[PDB]
Amino acid sequence: MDEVLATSIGTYENRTLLVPDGRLALTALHKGKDYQGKPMFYVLFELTNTTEKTQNIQLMIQSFMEVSQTVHGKAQNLQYAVLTDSPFQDKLDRLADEINPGETIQGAYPYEFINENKPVHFKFRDRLLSLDEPIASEEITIT
């Protein structure tokens, strides 16, 4: 026992996240505009519901990939970003819709981008007994 992360299960590379809970796969992140026609970002990922439930989707993504930026000299959990009107309203409703347990699909999950000037710590973890740091991590500069 070399104290492996996530007990050697999931991985993060090749623009894709493999896990037992599901099967996330980054297709192509795209940036947009919100109420302030600036702070806005879309997380284009391929969340495949491997489970057997038709419950909401956000109930899974909230345990798959999390995002947190800096503010007031501390780290905060980036929540759903509000926007007036965007073309990606279809994939957006996903968070407020159900999933396809056993089918191949994808969706999105935008959040507060006010800190567009700051890097977005793209982390990936899951309830697979980790504790000692998430499955992985990588910083990216979008927008």
Domain ranges of the chain: 1-143
* Contact criterion met (CB below 8 Å) for 87 and 44: no
Rg (CA), the chain: 15
CA distance 95 to 107: 8
Residue 112 tokens read as 């507060």
Q: Determine the residue type at 86.
A: S
In the CATH scheme, what architecture does the domain 1-143 have? Sandwich (2.60)
Method: NMR
46 contacts 26 by C-beta, under 8 angstroms: yes
- Token digits of residue 69: 């930026």
Closest listed residue to residue 133, CA positions, set 8, 1, 5: 5
Give how far Cα 9 sits from Cα of 19, 68, 127, Å: 7, 24, 11
Which are the contacts of 1, defined by CB distance < 8 A and separation ≥ 6? none
Q: Angle 17-20-25 (CA atoms, 0-180°, nearest 5)?
A: 25
